[PDB]
Amino acid sequence: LESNTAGDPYTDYEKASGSFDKAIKTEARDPLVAAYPIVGVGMEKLIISTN
Amino acid sequence: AVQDSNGESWNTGLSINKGESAYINANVRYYNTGTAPMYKVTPTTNLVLD
């Protein structure tokens, strides 16, 4: 009864057939898994310039 | 009594800002080794000291 079972922008046929973007993993191709990226930011060092 | 005096003086200074003490200008040059041309080349570059 739905066209986006997982909630991600790609539909059921696109995900199942792999017609979507080719850089998304194979596990995302089943309709019940969302292709939703998780991006974070990690600091490496801090520089202080006294004025 | 009468007193007459006259002289001169000199001075010189130098002020520095410790937050922005210089400006760096870099001469770069792009190149292509791929297969297709790229119009409107807008690259991003870093500048590492140590």
Automatic annotation (TrEMBL), chain B:
Name of the protein in its database record: ADP-ribosyltransferase binding component
Name of the coding gene: cdtB
Part of the full-length chain shown: 366 to 415 of 876
Organism: Clostridioides difficile
